Structure formats: C-alpha cells, structure tokens
Symmetry: C2
Subunit: 137 residues, 2 copies
Amino acid sequence: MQLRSVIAADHPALFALWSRTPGIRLRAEDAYPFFLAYLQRNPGLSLLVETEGEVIACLMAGHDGRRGYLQHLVVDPGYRGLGLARRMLDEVLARLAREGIGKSHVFVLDAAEEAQAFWRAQSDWERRKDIQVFSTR
Amino acid sequence: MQLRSVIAADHPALFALWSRTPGIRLRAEDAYPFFLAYLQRNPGLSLLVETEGEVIACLMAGHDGRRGYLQHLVVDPGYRGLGLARRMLDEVLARLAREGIGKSHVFVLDAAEEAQAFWRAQSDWERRKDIQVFSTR
C-alpha cells in the first residue's frame, strides 16, 4: 500500500483507472498533454496509491495561487474501508498549505449520490449554500 | 482609457479599489504576498483599466492547469455602461485559451444581486444547476 506523487509516466495507469470509474466522464483534458501540463504546474499535489505495481486510488489536485481545487478522487471498489480517501485528502491539503493555499474547493454532481455522501461526511468541509457558480458554456 | 496586465506594483491601487467596493470582502489572500505569488503564477491573466493615472476597473484571473477561475471583477460606478467588464472578460478568456484553458468558472454570492444580474446576462456563461460546491471550513 504505497502513497506517492503522481508523475507524468503514470498517465496510462491513471487513465485506465478513470476509464473504469463509472462516475467519471472522460474529457479532452484527461488526455496526456493536459495531464503533463497539470503536473508540471502542480508538482507533488496530485497523489496515488499503488500496491503490487497496480494503481488503486488517486486524488488529482492543484491550485491557482489563491485556492485549491480537487479533481478526480477515486478509490477502487476492491480497496474501500482502508482510509485511502482520507489519507490522500490529508496529504494533499498539507502539501497545498506549503504553497500557502489555505482554502480548497471541490465540485460534486447532484447525480453523484455516493460522492455527495462522502463529502457530507467530511467534518473539515462544508457544502456551500451561499453561492452560485457560473461556467463558460 | 487603457487596458493592461496587472503587475505587482499595482497592489496598493488595486487593494484600495477593492476596499471601496462593497461587493468585496477582503481576505488574507488579497494581501501583497499572495497577490505577488498569484501574479507570478498567472502572468498576464489579470487585467485592469486605468485612466488619468487612476485604476477604474479590474478582473483578477488565473488557472490551475485545468480550469480558469475568475476573482474580483470591479468596474467603478462612474465608468459603467462603457463595456469595460465585457472587454476585460473577452481578453482574459483569450489569454487563458493560449494556455490551454477552455473552461472557466466564477463563484458569485446569492447576496450579490448586481453580480448575479451581470453574470445572468452573459450568453457565453451558464449558471450551474447540476453541482454542489464543498469548501474547506
């Protein structure tokens, strides 16, 4: 059970992970070039857990110099109950604070009832009731 | 009426502008060191408009390598109806596109009826009905 920084060479294994994660809709920026630039801008901030050379969990993260933003938090079905999510989440938040980032955000689909339950259960996070989000179409 | 990149030396003028802008609540990350880091990480992405040596509008922006995030959109009350917000917005979105950032977000308080109205009127943006945002406490 090893936790470590995602690097560029992890792309195949991570992309296969995301492809088999039913709540993830793959996008153009899950492809290598976007991934490479994301890692180079956020070095050390995205983490994975591997075991026996297989990647079973990840948390992609980065920031814009003001706030942190979490992206794809995945724990393989065979690896639930081991605290992995919390463990990746703790280490990403600490790494972010080294860069001065004290506040982070995550977006979560209404559809994604498991993901919503996960985030409601995190005592160090709150669901935002005071804001609208607008996005480019 | 000149539009240009925000640079580090603009901190005192921009900080005073945000201080007299009622929709903004000044936080730790608006102080000089966070501003300086934000600009270094997002060079040329934040814009301001000046006239007669006075700053009369701004749009702070940046990205985390995957998405753009807009921050402190201000247009002085004496300079409304000149298209300034739109002008800064179009240039920000084009500079982001060069870096590969094709989708961007802005958070807007429910209480900010004037910002709500402005974002609702922008056809290239959409209010998100499909997500929750969770933030660290």
